[PDB]
Amino acid sequence: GKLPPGPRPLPLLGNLLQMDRRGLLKSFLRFREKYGDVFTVHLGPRPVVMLCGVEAIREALVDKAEAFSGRGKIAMVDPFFRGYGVIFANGNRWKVLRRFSVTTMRDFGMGKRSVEERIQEEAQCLIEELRKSKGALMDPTFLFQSITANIICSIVFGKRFHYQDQEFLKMLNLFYQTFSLISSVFGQLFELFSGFLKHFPGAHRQVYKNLQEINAWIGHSVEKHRETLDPSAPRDLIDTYLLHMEKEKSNAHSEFSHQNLNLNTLSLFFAGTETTSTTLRYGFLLMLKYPHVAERVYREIEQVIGPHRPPELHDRAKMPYTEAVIYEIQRFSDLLPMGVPHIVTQHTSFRGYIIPKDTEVFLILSTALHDPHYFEKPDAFNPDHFLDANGALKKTEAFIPFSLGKRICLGEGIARAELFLFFTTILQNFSMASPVAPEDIDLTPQECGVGKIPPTYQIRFLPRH
Numbered sequence: 001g002k003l004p005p006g007p008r009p010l011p012l013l014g015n016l017l018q019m020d021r022r023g024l025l026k027s028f029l030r031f032r033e034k035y036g037d038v039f040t041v042h043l044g045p046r047p048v049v050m051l052c053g054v055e056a057i058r059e060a061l062v063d064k065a066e067a068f069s070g071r072g073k074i075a076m077v078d079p080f081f082r083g084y085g086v087i088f089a090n091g092n093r094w095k096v097l098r099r100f101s102v103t104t105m106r107d108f109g110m111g112k113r114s115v116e117e118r119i120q121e122e123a124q125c126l127i128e129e130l131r132k133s134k135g136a137l138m139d140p141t142f143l144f145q146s147i148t149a150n151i152i153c154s155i156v157f158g159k160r161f162h163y164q165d166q167e168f169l170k171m172l173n174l175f176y177q178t179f180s181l182i183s184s185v186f187g188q189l190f191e192l193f194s195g196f197l198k199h200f201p202g203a204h205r206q207v208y209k210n211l212q213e214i215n216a217w218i219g220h221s222v223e224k225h226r227e228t229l230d231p232s233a234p235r236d237l238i239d240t241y242l243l244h245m246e247k248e249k250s251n252a253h254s255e256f257s258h259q260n261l262n263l264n265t266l267s268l269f270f271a272g273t274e275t276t277s278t279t280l281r282y283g284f285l286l287m288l289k290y291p292h293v294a295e296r297v298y299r300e301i302e303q304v305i306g307p308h309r310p311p312e313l314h315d316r317a318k319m320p321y322t323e324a325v326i327y328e329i330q331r332f333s334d335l336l337p338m339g340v341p342h343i344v345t346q347h348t349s350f351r352g353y354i355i356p357k358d359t360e361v362f363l364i365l366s367t368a369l370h371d372p373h374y375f376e377k378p379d380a381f382n383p384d385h386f387l388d389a390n391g392a393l394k395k396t397e398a399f400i401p402f403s404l405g406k407r408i409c410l411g412e413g414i415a416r417a418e419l420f421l422f423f424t425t426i427l428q429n430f431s432m433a434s435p436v437a438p439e440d441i442d443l444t445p446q447e448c449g450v451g452k453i454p455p456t457y458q459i460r461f462l463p464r465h
């Protein structure tokens with residue numbers, strides 16, 4: 001007959017005075033200690049229901065999908081997206097854009113040989129690039145974004161960009177900076193008080209500007225596509241979308257609008273770049289801290305693939321250890337600890353509580369990923385979390401870094417293909433070194449809000465034999 005219980009709110013400030021200084025996620029984990037897995041927190045002026053643990057998350061996202069499949073806002077980027085694009089769309093717009101983005105990504109490769117080939121080709125470009133560096137120290141963030149960006153680029157814009165291209169590097173810089181600012185301490189505070197803080201200067205202004213600058217670059221590329229469009233042969237997703245615009249042009253309410261074009265494309269480009277690159281960033285940081293694991297990965301590569309033939313997706317079933325190491329890098333690095341917010345789309349009863357239409361819901365994915373019933377010592381990096389006694393791969397229903405249900409990550413198969421191919425192709429050709437001894441490597445994220453973002457680091461890729 002009411003919302004889940006939770007800390008007693010003030011007017012105006014919500015549960016501000018009961019929050020933890022270290023961030024939203026910490027705040028919610030202390031609430032979970034007292035209230036259990038289903039609780040309400042007032043983030044400024046509104047109630048947000050928190051769902052923790054795989055059972056509650058799955059009960060909401062899979063058994064009540066008719067109710068929990070709506071998308072809430074992220075205060076820091078809503079002023080830009082405004083419900084346009086597949087990530088932030090709702091209702092019929094999401095239905096159309098979801099169907100479209102999934103389907104046309106497949107058209108042009110996703111989950112087919114074509115994208116595997118694109119990934120393998122891109123890994124060969126990376127390797128050639130790392131060879132040219134001749135064991136120099138770099139922060140590899142730029143290359144990890146470039147390779148993941150070039151995969152989604154080949155599908156969306158019909159092309160890849162060269163690693164040396166400054167205009168490309170500029171977009172990458174903007175995705176990196178924006179993800180950090182969104183995840184910053186200011187970005188968390190903005191989630192609570194955006195109604196008041198938007199009137200003043202701050203990072204929300206910088207994120208909107210960055211986004212608009214990415215939007216412009218995407219505008220120019222859309223114009224180029226418009227000029228050269230061949231209706232009998234679309235080259236990529238922009239062309240296919242442009243064809244949908246025309247087919248539907250007599251309907252003033254068509255979802256295939258120009259704002260959806262720019263913002264859906266931006267959504268895909270952003271998500272297709274920054275999620276996988278950040279994961280890899282933690283992977284190599286993790287490798288540096290646990291060189292024994294890197295070594296054991298390389299032994300497997302030697303034995304299953306050898307030193308020269310390039311890794312392919314068919315290699316996965318025969319490399320349980322590397323696959324365990326990648327699962328554990330995903331579990332540990334916990335990209336979106338609170339997922340992306342949802343919002344129930346009708347009155348729903350959940351475990352005896354009534355959750356009104358339009359209440360926001362955070363599914364704390366992190367609580368599934370750190371569940372001590374599924375992972376012993378969930379705070380430590382340990383690939384044994386994903387292996388049985390025999391050394392065979394052990395998958396678990398608690399492994400939900402892409403979430404579940406109707407809004408489940410639509411790039412899951414791509415991201416898994418990229419993580420395996422890029423991780424193994426790099427390790428087959430190179431070992432890693434850095435100036436910081438493994439004992440002294442700090443894994444503490446540089447930001448932790450919407451995104452968990454690893455700290456910067458230097459690394460060397462040393463060629464084998």
Ligand code: HEM
Pocket residue numbers: 071086087088098152267268271272273275276279335336339340341365401402403404406407408409410411412414415
């Ligand atoms: C390690 C890599 C990735 C992780 C951990 C990840 C994680 C997630 C999560 C947790 C969600 C939210 C699902 C929900 O709201 O319940 C999401 C949504 C989404 N992701 Fe991924 N993602 C990754 C890679 C990708 C890639 C490579 C792409 C694009 C090719 C992509 C595109 C999207 C899109 C478009 C959505 C919104 C889906 C919708 O709202 O219907 N992601 N992702």
Ligand SMILES: CC1=CC[C@@H]2C[C@H]1C2(C)C
Pocket residue numbers: 074077087267270271274275340450
């Ligand atoms: C799916 C997402 C990946 C990264 C950040 C959070 C969303 C974004 C706002 C595009």
